[PDB]
Point group: D2
Chain length 121, copies 4
């Protein structure tokens, strides 16, 4: 398993020690508070009221937690994933990323705390 | 394992099929959007800024997900619990509840989607 | 989890730390060599060529590993059980026992090494 | 998880759907009755009284269940493995094999039934 934090201000994200392999079942739980610029903070689902003006992941809200597995495209994580198997082909290290518009991370603040583990399969 | 929905306006809570037994380890993941009255909605951690006005659980925010286990007090859940063991002498049926003030549930809306599993031991 | 040894010559068997509760999924693995009297030894499946002359479990061979759960009848274990769920209404402490004819355990020798754990469920 | 049979007379063994990856924890349970030639049969630990005449696995008895992982040498399985981690530098598909002398498999009989799964990590 892996525990750690993802900073809202880091366009490169946080690499983990979890290597996702074909067939793996994983569980992720995410918590905490972050902002993409405003004084308000949101949880790991982000801001449901904010439009997409060029986010790295178009399938989650601005301010959400997302990931990449190897050199996949972005995959939504939000509050987490329960006994989840990847939409197929994907493989590699899990990198966690805060969803914002590239070039605009400089006004971001806060972080998410994240646990990941592999399940029975 | 159990999957289901906890309505924000259900004061009595959602009774699950999980009986927490001595020594059990469990994982919970919660998602969704709900409100304790305002037009804005919050995720399962609730609203960090709203003051505690006699919530059923003093150790979680207004609009957070909490639970009881048998005769326990309320216990916080938020976005979830990762490979977690309960307080000494707590056991029995898990009921999931939206954290609000008694008698003030009638203006609530939305729901949280929740999964609960037992882990290896 | 429980890890230990089940002696062939112990008619009362071995009361483990594992309390089987409704819905639990368990794994048991058993290894080793034991005898119900002869100079030869058999593994946890016992002696397939030996007749049943009043065995405590009629559904496994003389010299096999079996168990009781709470106040159940004997249940075959053999080399182990993989992600196993008990029949309805069976619950309580797991006792491991060597399968022999009652009153004939005194000439027995050897033991099985046994691991029991609760699995995800 | 994989469930299947391993024929005692199959010198190439039985390839499974399990790909062992670094960090994986697995469980195996094996059952059944097989022979390397005599009319008598033995369980998955094999025959403790027979000498090694050039077995594919010198670390288990003739008639025992063994395995290979990818390009590995033979590793004992016997009655099974509980929440087991492979040696470092061992990875790839699991193949199950009956322990006999190469070229002498043709007079073998019976089989072992085997379950393999990946466990929480
Ligand atoms: C100035 C500010 O502009 C936006 S918030 C804005 O969001 C983008 C993503 O869409 C980037 O993260 C920027 O860094 C953020 O500042 C308005 O919603 C806000 O009300 C305010 O006017
Ligand atoms: C009228 C309303 O009052 C509160 S919201 C209020 O919160 C309590 C819990 O503290 C109960 O759930 C009520 O049912 C809710 O209406 C203010 O924060 C809000 O701005 C508004 O004035
Ligand atoms: C003829 C037979 O010889 C052996 S059994 C023998 O074992 C080897 C492995 O050591 C091969 O599997 C052969 O296929 C087997 O036949 C004696 O132990 C037996 O009593 C009998 O004389
Ligand atoms: O049938 C069981 C019986 O088998 C014979 S050979 C043993 O000597 C006895 O002690 C008893 O275990
Ligand atoms: Ca920003
Ligand atoms: Ca309310
Ligand atoms: Ca005896
Ligand atoms: Ca042979
Ligand atoms: Cl806080």
């Amino acid at each position: 398993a892996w525990k750690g934090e993802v900073l809202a201000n880091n366009e490169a994200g946080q690499v983990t020690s979890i290597i996702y392999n074909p067939g793996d079942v994983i569980t992720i739980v995410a918590a905490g508070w972050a902002s993409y610029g405003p004084t308000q903070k949101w949880g790991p689902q982000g801001d449901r009221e904010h439009p997409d003006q060029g986010l790295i992941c178009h399938d989650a809200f601005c301010g959400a937690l997302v990931m990449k597995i190897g050199n996949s495209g972005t995959i939504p994580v939000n509050t987490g994933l329960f006994r989840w198997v990847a939409p197929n082909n994907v493989q590699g290290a899990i990198t966690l990323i805060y969803n914002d518009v590239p070039g605009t991370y400089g006004n971001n603040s806060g972080s998410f705390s994240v646990n990941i583990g592999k399940d029975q399969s």
